[PDB]
A paper describes a structure:
The final two three-dimensional (3-D) maps were resolved at 2.79 Å (full particles with genome) and 3.40 Å (empty particles without genome), respectively, based on the Fourier shell correlation (FSC) 0.143 criterion. The current resolution of the map for the full particle allows us to build ab initio atomic models of the MCPs. In each asymmetric unit, MCP-A and MCP-B share a similar tertiary structure, and the overall structures of these two subunits are well aligned with each other, showing a root mean square deviation (RMSD) of 0.66 Å for 728 Cα atom pairs. Each MCP-A is located close to the five-fold vertex, while MCP-B fills the vicinity of the three-fold axis. The ab initio models revealed that the first residue of the N-terminus of both MCP-A and MCP-B was clearly located at Pro789, which provides strong evidence for cleavage at CM-1 between residues Asn788 and Pro789 in OmRV. The C-terminal residues 1641–1685 of MCP-A are disordered. The MCP-B C-terminal residues 1618–1682 form a Ω-like arm structure composed of four loops and three α-helices. It extends along the interface between MCP A-B-A and interacts extensively with two neighbouring MCP-As. All these MCP A-B-A interactions strongly fasten the capsid decamer around the five-fold axis. However, in OmRV-LZ, the C-terminus of MCP-B, instead of N-terminus, play roles in stabilizing the capsid.
Recently, several unassigned viruses isolated from mosquitoes, including the Omono River virus (OmRV), were identified as totivirus-like viruses, with features similar to those of the Totiviridae family. Here, we identified a new strain of OmRV and determined high-resolution structures for this virus using single-particle cryo-electron microscopy. Generally, members of Totiviridae and totivirus-like viruses have a non-segmented double-stranded RNA (dsRNA) genome containing two large overlapping open reading frames (ORFs), namely, ORF1 and ORF2, which encode the major capsid protein (MCP) and RNA-dependent RNA polymerase (RdRP), respectively. Similar to that of other members of Totiviridae, OmRV-LZ has a major capsid with icosahedral symmetry and a T = 1 lattice comprising 60 dimers composed of MCP-A and MCP-B. The central cross-sectional view of the map with the genome shows at least five visible layers of viral genome RNA packaged inside the capsid.
Residue numbers in the entry:
A (entry chain B): 789 to 1610, 1618 to 1682
B (entry chain A): 789 to 1640
C (entry chain A): 1338 to 1436
D (entry chain A): 1487 to 1536
E (entry chain A): 1039 to 1137
Write the structure that this text describes.
C-alpha cells in the first residue's frame, strides 16, 4: 500500500514479521484482485463488451519533485507469453536474428497420498478363489467389457506410491493456454504483443490465427507437413487394441486402458481419444505458432506477424511409442478376424481433418484397422503425425467438456489448479530492465538484449544454440511428478483409491477453464510471484554477480549455504523434499497478499508435507541483471525485473524497507532514520565521502567474516534508498576504492519497459517507474558495498535522517483499497436438494456397489477360505508394507 | 553420513553399539526408495536428466586438499548381473578368452510348520475305517477333476514335514530377472553394460534381445537344437497322466498333481503348465543369452554383442524326470484307449512355438499322446527340449498373472520376498579393485583379472574349468530349502493346511514382479548388503591370506574358530543350524539403515529360530583381493570391493572408524587420537620408522598368543587410516622387517572401477574414490602388522593426533558440506535469521523420518 | 453450447440436461431431466415408467427423460425454397396439440 | 445488468408474462427480430411475417 | 467361448406350439440387433387415383442399433437320463427337440 505521510512508512511491518509462518487457511489468488483496480470491470461481464483490448496498463496522475502534476501517466504490464518471430525494423517487418527460448523439466515418481484397494477388487479376488474349486476357466466378471484375464492382471501387485495426475494435467493446461489465444481481439490485451517488440501495433479487427510448424527461421518448422519432435528429432508410434494379448511382448508392461466414462458424448469422442492420447505422451509434439495482423507505429505498414508461445517451448519428456486399449462394445470372445474387430469398437479411432505426408501418410478422417489375434501383420501409426492432424481442431470449449467428464471419475480440481500454477510460473516472462535517469527506456530493435528475458523467479531463460530439432538437452529448470500407467489402470477401473483421487461434489473444474478471459488472468497471476521473490532477494544485499557465482564460491561459506537451500535437492524416505528457504517466500506470499498458493502433498513415512511451486526450482540458471543504454551489462545491483510501484500498490502488507516515498504536505515531505534508531554514520580516511546511517556492525567489517553476511535491517536499507535516489551516488569500498562489479553510468537506476502510447496518455516521469529497492551490500569478492556522497551533497540528506530537513521525491497520486477474497439458476433452485444428496453419495462411491459381503458369502463353498475373510483390505504403509516379519 | 566437520566424527557411534541386538520389527529396504538417493542430489553443474537410462551413476562436486573445486565428478555403480562373452579390443568386438562363472547349491528339508489335516481328509480316513472305501463307484470324481480312489490313496500318507515353496519361487524369480531385460533401452541404465567391458557403449535405439543356447565359445551352446543340461549333460524326461495308476512303478512315489488352479492361471493353459513344469524341475535347463547392440567409444564400430546373465548359471535342484497328473473335465472311468484319454483331459498338453531336433524331435505346437491303462508302450518326451520350446514365450506380465493366482491359492508374500533376497545375494556381482595413487584405474582388456568378480558377501565366485556340458567336482555356496511333492499333493487337493498357508489377495503380490524397473532396483539392493559385510571384515585387521587359510591351513586356533563361527552348521536330522556370528552382521544392517532383511523359519529339535541370507553361506571359500597395475596379486589388505563414498553416503549411521574426512583448510579439519583417550605410540627411530598412536598391547605385541586376535578399537583404526592417506606408507612388522603378504607398489591404495565419461563429467580426483578403511593388523603368520612413516614424514600427523595441527584430505561437496577458505576470519557465533525462520519446519521433517 | 461457445452459462446448461457416468461406469441421471418429469406429471396427472439405478449403493430411479447423451443437434425450421432458419427456439408441433 | 449482453454465467429469467407479450407482438403481421440497438442479429431469420 | 454360453430352459421350449420357433425367438432376443432390414410394402395411388402401385417403406425400429453379440452357443435340455454323447446319432436322439 502507498504511504500518505511519513507516519505510515515509519509504522510499516518489519520483514521478519512477514516471513513468520502463519497457521490460518486462505483462499486462492485468482487474479481478480488486480482486475478490480486496473480496469473498469466491477462484476462479471462479457469480455467483448468490455474491450479489454484497451485495459492493459497502470494509469494515474503523477506528482513531480519540482511540484508540477502530470496527468494520465502510465506503466506497462511486465509479463507475456509471446515471443516475436518476425520483428519490425525501420518501420518494416523483418525476420528475427535471435534463437528461441527453451525450458526443461525433471520428471520422476514420488510418494503421494497412501492408497487402498476397493471393495470391488475384494470381490474379484473372491471370485477367483471360489472358482478354484472347479474345472471351469471363467475366473471372474469382466468389468466394463474388458477381457476378464485383463482385469485379472490389472488387479495385481499394486505400487505403494499412490497416483499424481500432474504431468497429464500440465499438458492439458499448456494446450488450453495455447488455444485460448484464438478468440477475438477485443478480449486480448494489445500490450501482450508488444512487451518485446515495442514498435509493432496489433489490429483489433481480426482474431489471431493459431497454427502448427510454420516458422520462417532457424529450422523451427519441425518437419512441417512431415512432423518430428522439436527436442528428440524423431517420430513416435501409436497402436490401438481391443485386448492386451495382441500387444507386442516387448512393451506389454507400458499399456494404458482408456476408460469409457469419457467418450460418452454423441459427438467429439474420437477427438476425445486423440486428446487423451496427447495427455500421456511427450510434450511438445510440435511447435505451435500464433499469427497476428499488425501495423507500424504510424499505422501505415501492415502485415501478418509471427510469434511463438512460451508454452510450446517447454519440454516435458514422456513416452514416444504407445499402446492404447479401446473399450469393447459388448462382452464377447476376442476377435479372430478383422471385421469382427472393427464391428466391436465402442469408439473407432480416426485421423483428424488434416492430411500428412511421409511414410505412413494419413488422409483426413482416415479410420484405423484394429489389431486382432492371428493377424498376419501388426499395424501402427507414427504419433507425431496423428497428433499433427488433430492439432488444428482442438479448442477451449471442448477441453472444458472433456475435463468435465474426466471430473466424474476422479478428483481433478486441486490437482488442475496446482498444475495451472506451474503453467503460469514457467510461462509468463519479462524482458530485462534498462538503466536511465528518466522514466523510460528500451534496447535496440532486433538485438540480443531486446529478447533476453526472465522468469517470475528472477532467473534468466536459456536459449537454443542450434537449429531445431535439438540434438542435445538443457539442464532441467524444475521438477514435476510423473503419472504411472499401472496405477492409472487400477484407478481408472475402480480397483483402487486414495484421498487425492476422490471425486468432488462440485463435479466441476476451476473457473479459468473454458473462459476467453483466461490469457489476461494468467498474465495477471505472475505479478504476486515476482513481488514475493523480489522481497526475498532485496531483503539481503547480494549483487547479481555474487549470486551468479555463489554456488561454488570458496571465498565465503555463508554464501554457499544461501544458494544451496533455495533449491530442491533434498530427499528422504524415498520421496522429494521442498527447498528449505522456499518456505520463506511461501510465508511472505501469505502474509503479504492474504492468499494461499496451490500445493501438492508428499508423504514422508506417511506424514504429509505441502509443496508449492516456490519450493521446486533447480540450480543452474543465471540471475537477472540490467543493461546500460548502450547494452553493456550492469552487475552492481541485486536482481530486479519489475518497477516497485507494482510491488507497493498491490499488497495488503509490505516490509518497511520497500515502501513508497510519501507526498509533499506543506512543510513535511520525506524522512529518515538515525542514531536514535540504533544506526551510525560511516566515515573513512577520505574527507570528501559520506555514507548514511547504517547498522553498527558495519563499522567493524570491510570484508564480512566467513560464515556471516549482511543482516536484515529495514531502516538502514531505507537510508540506502534515500542515498541512491539522489542523482549522484558512488558505489564503493570501505576505503573508497572501486568494487570489481560493473556499475551504471552515474546517477542512473533501472527503469521499466517502454510501450507506445494512446492519445491522451503521458510517459512516466522521473523515478516514478523504477526499481529503487535494489540496494547492493555484498560484493563478489567478499567486500561490503557503500553508497557515498560528497560532503556538500551530504548535508541535506543527513539532516533529513535527523528530521531537521526534507527531501523532494516524485509519487503516484493513488489511494489504497484491498478487496475481500470474494450463481444459482432457477433450475438449480428447483433441483438443489437432489443435487445435495447425490453429491454426498458420489463422495463415497469409490469402487462401491450395493451388494455387500454378506450376500456374496451365501454364494460361496467355504467362507473361511475367502481371501477377503483372511485378508481384509488395509491402506498401504510407506515406503513399503512389512514383508517376512520375525514371526 | 559424510562429515562436514571433525565434531561429527568424534560423535560417531562405536562398532559395538551398532552390533547390539535391536528388538523392534522393521520394514523391508526396497530399491524403490534406494532409487531416490541417486536422483535428487546436490550440485549445480548437473543436468538432472529424467531417463532411467542416464540415472546410472554417482555425480558430484569435489574439493581438493589444495583448496581447488572440481565440478560434476563421477563414481560408477559397482554391481551387475551381466557377464560379457564378446569383448572389445582395438575398437572391435573379439571373441572372449575367459571361462564362464558358475554357482552351485545344496538342498535341505523343511520340518518347520508341520501340516494340519482338514475335515475332508479326516472324514475320508474315517470312511476308510468304517468301510473299505467300498461304497464308491468306478467313475466317481470331485469337481476338481480327480477320481476319488486317488484322493483316498493319497490321503493315507502321513507326513512329519511342513511345506516350503522356496526353490519353486526362486526359479520363478531368476527367470523373471532374465526376462526383465527385454524392455526398451531407455528403461535400463547403460552402466550395467560396461562394468566389466569398459570400452563399450550401449545404444539407446533398440531393446536387448533375449535368446537361448546362442553362445560363441567354450561349448556354451549346449548342443544347440538338441538341448542337454549345462551341468552333467543328458536330457531329462516328462510325462502326462490322467491318473496315477498309469505312472510306472518306482516313479509312482514321486508324481505331482497339477491343480486346475494352475491351468486357469493364464489365458493359455499350456503356458501356465510349462511354467509350472519349469518351476518344479531342475535349473538351469538351458543357457539364456542377452544380446545388445553396442558401439565404439568414438562410436565408430557398432555391432551386436553377447552377454550371459548371472541368474542363468546358478545350479538348483536335481529332478531330471517327472510325471504330471492332469484334471479330467468329464466324470469318466479311467481311459483304455488313446482317443479316450485325449478327449478326457481338461486341456491337452502341447509343445511350444519353437521347434527342436534330436532322437525325439518336437514339431512346433505338437500334441502329446496321453498315457492309458493298455500299454503297448509307455509314452514320453525329452524335457530340455520341451522347455526349449516354451523358452521364448515367458513374459513378466504373465508371470504377474501367475503370481496372483498363486497368491490366491496360498500366500506368496513372505516367501517370495525371501526368495527375491536370495536372488539378489546370489546374482549381483562386482569386479575386483585395482590399486592406484590417483582417482581411476582398471585391468587390461580381455585379461583374466578383468573378469574376476565377487558377491556382496565378498567371496570370490567359482569359475568353470572345462567346456560345457560340465563334469565338475561341485563347489557349492549356500543351502536352500526344497519343495516336497507329497506335501504338495496333500495341500493341492484340500487334504492339509499349515500356519503359513493362509490365502491372500492378488493385490498383495510384491510390486517388483512384472515391473520394468526391477533390474535397476536389483543393483541397488546389492549396495547396502555389502556395506554390512564390509563393516564386518574391517573391524578386525585380518588379511586376505589369513582368510584364505583359516579353514584349510593354519595352526592358529583363533582363526579356526573365527572362520568357523561366521558360517552355518548341520543338525543331526540334517537341518540347518544358523551361523553364530552372522547374527552380528544382521544387527549391523538394522542399525545402519533402520530396515530389516527377510526372515525365514527354522527349527532345532522343535525350537523356533529364524534365518536370513546372512546366515546361510558355506565355509571353505576364497576371498576378495586387489590387483596392482600390470595385474600382480596383492593381499596385504583386508578384503574390499567398493569405495568408501558408497559406505558413507547411504548409511543413516556408521561406526566411528569409517567416517568421511572433513574438508581441508577449515578450523576442525581432519585430526587423530592420542594418549588421553587411552592410546600409545610405537617408535622405531633407529630405522626411520614411526607408527601412530595405537591400542595398548596385551602380551600380543609382536606375535598374537594362540587363541587370541586383535581387539576392536575404532580410534586406532582411524589413526591407521591417517597414516595410510599420507603418500608413502610402509607395511612392516614390530622389528621393521618385511611381512609375508604381498604388498602394493609404494603409495598405492585400492580404487574404484573406471567407466567411460558423458560429456561435461570429470574423473574423480585424489583419494575421493579410494577405499581406505581396510587397514591390516593380523597376518597369516600370526604377527602384527604396522603402518610406518619415516621420522620426518611422521612429524605433522603426530601433532594432528595430538590436536595441535590440522591435516588436509579431499572430499565430496554434498549434503551440507561446504568449501573452506584459506584465511578463516571467524566472527562471533551467529545463527542466521533464515535458519531461525525455518527451524521448526525443518525439525518436523526429521521427526517424520524418526517415525518411519 | 457443448462444442463451441465461450459463455459458461450455456455450457452448464447443455451439460445439466443430460446424464453422466459413475466411477464404476454406472449411469448418474440427468440433473435437469427431473424437471421435465415433473412437468409431465403436472400437465397430465400421469406418470412415466421408472427404472432402478444406484450410486455407490444408494437407490435412485431413471426415466427415458434422463437417459439421453450430450452432443446432439437440434430441431430447426425451413423457409419456403428450403433455406435454413434458426432464430427460433426449437419446434416440431403446432400449439393446438400442446393446448 | 443484462440489457444488451448477458453477463458471463447468467441467462434470461423465467417470466411467463413477457413471453406472452412477445407472442402478441409476433402474431401481428410484420415482426422484426433485432437487438438492443436495433441492429441485425447473427442468426438466420424467416422471410418477413412468416 | 465357454465363459459366454447361455442355457436354454425347457420353459422356453414349451412356450409355443412349435419349439423351434420359440427357440429362434429366444436366439434373436439375445443376439445383436438388427440382423436384417425389414421392409413394409403397401399399395398406393395418385391423389387423383390415376397411378396405383406397390410402394416401399422402411420401419424406424429396423434401423436402431443394439447389442454386439455376433456369436453364441446354446445349451439344450436332454429328454433322457443319459451320459454325454460320443457319436453324432446319440447326440441327435438325446435332445428334447432338435434345432
Amino acid at each position: 500500500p502507498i504511504s500518505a505521510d511519513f507516519s505510515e512508512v515509519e509504522n510499516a511491518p518489519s520483514f521478519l514479521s512477514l516471513a513468520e509462518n502463519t497457521d490460518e487457511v486462505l483462499k486462492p489468488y485468482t487474479g481478480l484482485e488486480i482486475q478490480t483496480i486496473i480496469t473498469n470491470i466491477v462484476g462479471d461481464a462479457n469480455p467483448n463488451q468490455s474491450r479489454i483490448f484497451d485495459q492493459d496498463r497502470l494509469r494515474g496522475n503523477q506528482y513531480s519533485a519540482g511540484g508540477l502534476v502530470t496527468q494520465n501517466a502510465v506503466s506497462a504490464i511486465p509479463f507475456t507469453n509471446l515471443i516475436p518471430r518476425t520483428i519490425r525494423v525501420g518501420n518494416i517487418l523483418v525476420n528475427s536474428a535471435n534463437r528461441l527460448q527453451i525450458t526443461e523439466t525433471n520428471v520422476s515418481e514420488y510418494y503421494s497420498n497412501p492408497i487402498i484397494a476397493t471393495k470391488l477388487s475384494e470381490m474379484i479376488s473372491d471370485q477367483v478363489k471360489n472358482n478354484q474349486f472347479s474345472t471351469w476357466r471363467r475366473d471372474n466378471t469382466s468389468l466394463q467389457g474388458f477381457n476378464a484375464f485383463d482385469i485379472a492382471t490389472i488387479n495385481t501387485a499394486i505400487l505403494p506410491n499412490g497416483l499424481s495426475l500432474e504431468s497429464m494435467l500440465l499438458k492439458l493446461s499448456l494446450l488450453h493456454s495455447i488455444k485460448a489465444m484464438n478468440v477475438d481481439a477485443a478480449s486480448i490485451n494489445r500490450s501482450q504483443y508488444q512487451v518485446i517488440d515495442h514498435n509493432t501495433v496489433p489490429t483489433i479487427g481480426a482474431p489471431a490465427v493459431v497454427g502448427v510448424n510454420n516458422s520462417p527461421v532457424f529450422g523451427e518448422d519441425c518437419g512441417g507437413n512431415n512432423p518430428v519432435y522439436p527436442f528428440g528429432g524423431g517420430t513416435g508410434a501409436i497402436a490401438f487394441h481391443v485386448t492386451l494379448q495382441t500387444v507386442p511382448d516387448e512393451r506389454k508392461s507400458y499399456a494404458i486402458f482408456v476408460p469409457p466414462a469419457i467418450l460418452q458424448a454423441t459427438s467429439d469422442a474420437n477427438e476425445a481419444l486423440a486428446l487423451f492420447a496427447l495427455s500421456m505422451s511427450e510434450w511438445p509434439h510440435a511447435l505451435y505458432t500464433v499469427t497476428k495482423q499488425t501495423t507500424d507505429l504510424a499505422g501505415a505498414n501492415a502485415g501478418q506477424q509471427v510469434f511463438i508461445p512460451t508454452q510450446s517451448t517447454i519440454h516435458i519428456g514422456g513416452r514416444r511409442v504407445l499402446d492404447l486399449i479401446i473399450p469393447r462394445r459388448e462382452i464377447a470372445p476376442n476377435p479372430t478376424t478383422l471385421v469382427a474387430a472393427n464391428a466391436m469398437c465402442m469408439v473407432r479411432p480416426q485421423a483428424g481433418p488434416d492430411a500428412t505426408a511421409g511414410a505412413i501418410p494419413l488422409a483426413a478422417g482416415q479410420l484405423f484397422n484394429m489389431n486382432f489375434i492371428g493377424a498376419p501383420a501388426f499395424e501402427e501409426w507414427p504419433m507425431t503425425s496423428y497428433l499433427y492432424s488433430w492439432a488444428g481442431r482442438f479448442d477451449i470449449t471442448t477441453i472444458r467438456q472433456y475435463m468435465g467428464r474426466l471430473a466424474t471419475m476422479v478428483g481433478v480440481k486441486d490437482a488442475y489448479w496446482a498444475a495451472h500454477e506451474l503453467n503460469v510460473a514457467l510461462s509468463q516472462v519479462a524482458p530485462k530492465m534498462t538503466t536511465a535517469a528518466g522514466g523510460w527506456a528500451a534496447q535496440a530493435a532486433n538485438s540480443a538484449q531486446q529478447s533476453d528475458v526472465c522468469y517470475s523467479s528472477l532467473l534468466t531463460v536459456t536459449r537454443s544454440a542450434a537449429n531445431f530439432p535439438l540434438a542435445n538437452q538443457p539442464a532441467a529448470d524444475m521438477r514435476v511428478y510423473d503419472t504411472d500407467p499401472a496405477t492409472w489402470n487400477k484407478v481408472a477401473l475402480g480397483l483402487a483409491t486414495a484421498a487425492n483421487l476422490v471425486p468432488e461434489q462440485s463435479m466441476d473444474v476451476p473457473f479459468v477453464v473454458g473462459d476467453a478471459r483466461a490469457s489476461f488472468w494468467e498474465r495477471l497471476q505472475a505479478i504476486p510471484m515476482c513481488i514475493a521473490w523480489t522481497m526475498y532477494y532485496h531483503s539481503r544485499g547480494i549483487t547479481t554477480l555474487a549470486w551468479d557465482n555463489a554456488y561454488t564460491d570458496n571465498t565465503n561459506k555463508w554464501l554457499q549455504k544461501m544458494v544451496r537451500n533455495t533449491f530442491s535437492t533434498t530427499q528422504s524416505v524415498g520421496t522429494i523434499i521442498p527447498a528449505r528457504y522456499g518456505k520463506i517466500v511461501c510465508n511472505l506470499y501469505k502474509n503479504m497478499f492474504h492468499r494461499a498458493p496451490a500445493y501438492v502433498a508428499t508423504s514422508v513415512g506417511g506424514k504429509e508435507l505441502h509443496i508449492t511451486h516456490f519450493e521446486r526450482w533447480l540450480p543452474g540458471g543465471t540471475y537477472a541483471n540490467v543493461y546500460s543504454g548502450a547494452g553493456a551489462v550492469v552487475n552492481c545491483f541485486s536482481p530486479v525485473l519489475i518497477p516497485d510501484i507494482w510491488c507497493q500498490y498491490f499488497t495488503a502488507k509490505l516490509p518497511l524497507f520497500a515502501g513508497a516515498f510519501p507526498p509533499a504536505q506543506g512543510q513535511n515531505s520525506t524522512k529518515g532514520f538515525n542514531s536514535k534508531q540504533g544506526l551510525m554514520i560511516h566515515r573513512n580516511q577520505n574527507n570528501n565521502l559520506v555514507a548514511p546511517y547504517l547498522e553498527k556492525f558495519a563499522d567493524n567489517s570491510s570484508y564480512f567474516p566467513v560464515g556471516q553476511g549482511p543482516e536484515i535491517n529495514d531502516m538502514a536499507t531505507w537510508n540506502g534508498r534515500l542515498w541512491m535516489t539522489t542523482g549522484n551516488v558512488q558505489y564503493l569500498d570501505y576505503s573508497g576504492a572501486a568494487i570489481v562489479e560493473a556499475v551504471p553510468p552515474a546517477g542512473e537506476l533501472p527503469v521499466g519497459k517502454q510501450i507506445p502510447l494512446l492519445a491522451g496518455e503521458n510517459a512516466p516521469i522521473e523515478l516514478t517507474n523504477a526499481a529503487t529497492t535494489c540496494v547492493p551490500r555484498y560484493s563478489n569478492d567478499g567486500r561490503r558495498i557503500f553508497t557515498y556522497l560528497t560532503t556538500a551533497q551530504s548535508v541535506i540528506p543527513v539532516q533529513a535522517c535527523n528530521r531537521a530537513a526534507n527531501l523532494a521525491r516524485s509519487c503516484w497520486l493513488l489511494s489504497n483499497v484491498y478487496a475481500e477474497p470474494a450463481v444459482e439458476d432457477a433450475f438449480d433452485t428447483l433441483t438443489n436438494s437432489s443435487f445435495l444428496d447425490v453429491a454426498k453419495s458420489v463422495a463415497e462411491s469409490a469402487g462401491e456397489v450395493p451388494a455387500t459381503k454378506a450376500l456374496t458369502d451365501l454364494q460361496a463353498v467355504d467362507v473361511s477360505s475367502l481371501p477377503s475373510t483372511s485378508d481384509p483390505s488395509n491402506v498401504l504403509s510407506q515406503p513399503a508394507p512389512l514383508m517376512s516379519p520375525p514371526t
